[PDB]
From a paper:
An understudied class of proteins in phosphotyrosine signaling, the receptor protein tyrosine phosphatases (RPTPs), are a family of single-pass transmembrane proteins whose architecture include an extracellular domain resembling those of cell adhesion molecules (CAMs) and intracellular single or tandem tyrosine phosphatase domains. In vertebrates, this diversity is typified by the leukocyte common antigen related (Lar) and its two homologs RPTPδ/PTPRD and RPTPσ/PTPRS, which form the type IIa family of RPTPs. The ectodomains of Lar-RPTPs resemble immunoglobulin (Ig)-superfamily CAMs and include three Ig-like domains followed by four to nine fibronectin type III (FN) repeats. Surprisingly, we uncovered a tripeptide, Lys-Gly-Asp (KGD), in the Dlar FN5 domain that is similar to the RGD motif in FN10 and is conserved in the Lar-RPTP homologs across species.
We thus determined the crystal structures of the FN5 domain of mouse LAR and the FN4-FN6 fragment of human RPTPδ. The LAR FN5 crystal structure was solved by molecular replacement using Dlar FN5 as the model and refined to a resolution of 1.7 Å, while the structure of the FN4-FN6 fragment was to a resolution of 1.77 Å. A similar conclusion can be drawn from examining the position of the KGD sequence within the structure of RPTPδ FN4-FN6. The three-domain fragment adopts an extended conformation, but the KGD sequence lies at the interface between domains FN4 and FN5, which makes the tripeptide unavailable for binding to integrins. Thus, if Dlar and its mammalian homologues interact directly with integrins, they will use a mechanism that is distinct from the canonical RGD/integrin binding interaction. (D) The crystal structure of domains FN4-FN6 of human RPTPδ is shown in a ribbon representation and colored green. The lysine and aspartate residues found in the KGD motif are shown in ball-and-stick representation.
Author numbering: 610 to 915
The structure:
């Protein structure tokens, strides 16, 4: 006898497969067809047991398999029955149900401050058996926090993978800098992965704050003193953003490199520079530091008249 023909399987959802067939050629049948049956088995699935669709009407040539596993392969045959019994089963067809969105978050989310206007976030792909498809990209969500609660509107940055690193994305080490942020401000960051079907589960939010700002520029006062010296005095910036910790002075002949670098504590606010000769130009560059670091340098060049 002849089996069903025109076997056609398609997946309309991540958990379903539409099976289609036609009766065997009537000139090649024997008895009258009375029903169809389907055999379907998840290959490599959580449930590897064969399942069946029974009692399909003789005039019915399509049937929807449902409650299948997401993005999973199924091997399928169709069999025609007569009043005698079942005939030979069709050729075997294997297709995979559709992709879905990831049910797991990106793995290993880590955050850290960069400077006063930016933070860094790192992550890896979701657990492979929770992706439900080829990961196509990620979205980093971040919202400004105030007293432990979100204040501003959330923003996002989308990262889309290139075709070249679809295949090795489980080994790619992902990271992103978010800039354009406010000094000394807390942000709550989440990361999602996406497939073609859409966005998946979000990581558990992680807090990260930008650093504080560095101090403003100090003010320089310069005097010509005896024996080819100059008294270099300074005043702290009014904007220190916390306790000042010291100063850094770079000085020497103008354009002549390298300059001499000296550091001072916050308690010191003058220095006598030596080898300051009449008829030459000298540069002084002074920055102030807090625990974050040094602010911009106040830069002054002086020329001693002859």
């Amino acid at each position: 006898s002849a089996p069903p023909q025109d076997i056609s399987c398609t997946s309309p959802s991540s958990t379903s497969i539409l099976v289609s067939w036609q009766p065997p050629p009537v000139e090649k049948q024997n008895g009258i067809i009375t029903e169809y049956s389907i055999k379907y088995t998840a290959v490599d699935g959580e449930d590897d047991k064969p399942h069946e669709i029974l009692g399909i009407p003789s005039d019915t040539t399509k049937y929807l398999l449902e409650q299948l596993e997401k993005w999973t392969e199924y091997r399928i045959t169709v069999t025609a029955h007569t009043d005698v019994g079942p005939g030979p089963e069709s050729l075997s067809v294997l297709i995979r149900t559709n992709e879905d969105v990831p049910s797991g978050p990106p793995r290993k989310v880590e955050v850290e401050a960069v400077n006063s206007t930016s933070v860094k976030v790192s992550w890896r792909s979701p657990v492979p058996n929770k992706q439900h498809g080829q990961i196509r990209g990620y979205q980093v969500h971040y919202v400004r926090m105030e007293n432990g609660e979100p204040k501003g509107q959330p923003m996002l940055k989308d990262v889309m993978l290139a075709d070249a690193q679809w295949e090795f994305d489980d080994t790619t080490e992902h990271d992103m800098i978010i800039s354009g942020l406010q000094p000394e401000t807390s942000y709550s960051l989440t990361v999602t992965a996406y497939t073609t079907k859409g966005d998946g589960a979000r990581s558990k939010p992680k807090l990260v704050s930008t650093t504080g700002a560095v101090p403003g520029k100090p003010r320089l006062v310069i005097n010509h003193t005896q024996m080819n010296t100059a008294l270099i005095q300074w005043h702290p910036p009014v904007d220190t953003f916390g306790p000042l910790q010291g100063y850094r002075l770079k000085f020497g002949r103008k354009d002549m490199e390298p300059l001499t670098t000296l550091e001072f504590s916050e308690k010191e606010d003058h220095f006598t520079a030596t080898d300051i000769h009449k008829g030459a130009s000298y540069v002084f560059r002074l920055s102030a530091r807090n625990k974050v670091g040094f602010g911009e340098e106040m830069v002054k060049e002086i020329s001693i008249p002859e």
